[PDB]
Design a protein around this ligand. Structure first.
Ligand SMILES: Nc1nc2c(ncn2[C@@H]2O[C@H](COP(=O)(O)OP(=O)(O)O)[C@@H](O)[C@H]2O)c(=O)[nH]1
Ligand SMILES: [Ca+2]
Ligand SMILES: [Cl-]
Ligand SMILES: [Cl-]
Ligand SMILES: [Cl-]
Ligand code: NA
Length: 169
């Protein structure tokens, strides 16, 4: 009887998909989570006063068979597209995840946030706020910077994505 919001974490390696997920789920910064391990998490949460369930698929890039990975995308209702602000190549990689999602969901308004993680490493920044905001503007998505280490904006990205799912679906 509860809304079930199906969230999928995407992004290239080491950007913080798992750390964000585990901070959200378990209030812990986890620094050694197996890079090849994908997992699903489910939690009851109160979204704007409504009890809902969030399901998070923390993807780990291991499924290379395109039909299978497209099936995983098709199941998702919203996407956190994560890059690390400290790795420009991970920002460049977001374009591919966007295209993969769009090919399957066929809706440019699919619930989607662009997430610049590792905001606590400003001294290592390789991706400017300006360029990330410009990309988000091009895609008509919001850009949020997070830190799985300090928990900055972690609840925000999950809740705001659920708000998009709620509004759009
Ligand atoms: N300083 C800092 N390190 C982070 C952050 N998020 C992840 N890390 C570190 O980056 C590494 C990779 O994170 P992980 O979540 O496993 O990356 P994934 O491959 O995208 O799942 C780990 O050592 C984390 O501790 C963050 O926000 N800040
Ligand atoms: Ca991971
Ligand atoms: Cl796995
Ligand atoms: Cl799983
Ligand atoms: Cl609570
Ligand atoms: Na612009």
């Amino acid at each position: 009887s509860l809304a079930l919001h199906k969230v999928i974490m995407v992004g290239s390696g080491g950007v913080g998909k798992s750390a964000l997920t585990l901070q959200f789920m378990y209030d812990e910064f986890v620094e050694d989570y197996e890079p090849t391990k994908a997992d699903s998490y489910r939690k009851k949460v109160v979204l704007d006063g409504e009890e809902v369930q969030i399901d998070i698929l923390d993807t780990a890039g291991q499924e290379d068979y395109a039909a299978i990975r497209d099936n995983y995308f098709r199941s998702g209702e919203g996407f956190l597209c994560v890059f690390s602000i400290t790795e420009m190549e991970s920002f460049a990689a977001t374009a591919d995840f966007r295209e993969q999602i769009l090919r399957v969901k066929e809706d440019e308004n699919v619930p989607f946030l662009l997430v610049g993680n590792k905001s606590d490493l400003e001294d290592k920044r390789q991706v400017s706020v300006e360029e990330a905001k410009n990309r988000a503007e091009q895609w008509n998505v919001n850009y949020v910077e997070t830190s799985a280490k300090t928990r900055a904006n972690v609840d925000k990205v999950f809740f705001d994505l659920m708000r998009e799912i709620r509004a759009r679906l």
